[PDB]
């Protein structure tokens, strides 16, 4: 009943979560990422990628490859189920995907692709 989850980035490299699960009753889930502390997107920005497991870390790493300028993800990317922009301290944005795009029984990875970040800025997403 509840369509949405708060996720934070904050200046230690850290999301506040490592875990999100979807109510099957959803039609669309909405993703509201945010960036509480004080350092500015080029040095410790983040943003919020969700892809299968398997494809993880191609996009990780083509992501590196694309730059800052293009938000550290390679553009129109086939394997990006959903995807917010690089944020920056005191920043917000926010994704909205169809549920439908998540199969039963599947756990998908979550990350952020600035380089390093996903060290420790991934997580789990599946529905239940
Ligand atoms: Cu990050």
Known sequence: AECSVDIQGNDQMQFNTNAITVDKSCKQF????????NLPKNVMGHNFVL?????????????????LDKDFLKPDDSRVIAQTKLIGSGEKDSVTFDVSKLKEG??????????????????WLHLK
């Open 30 to 37: 909405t993703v509201n990422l945010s960036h509480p502390g």
């Open 51 to 67: 892809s299968t497991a398997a494809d993880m870390q191609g996009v990780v790493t083509d992501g590196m490859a694309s730059g």
């Open 106 to 123: 599947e756990q998908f990875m979550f990350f952020c692709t600035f380089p390093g970040h996903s060290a420790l800025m991934w997580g």
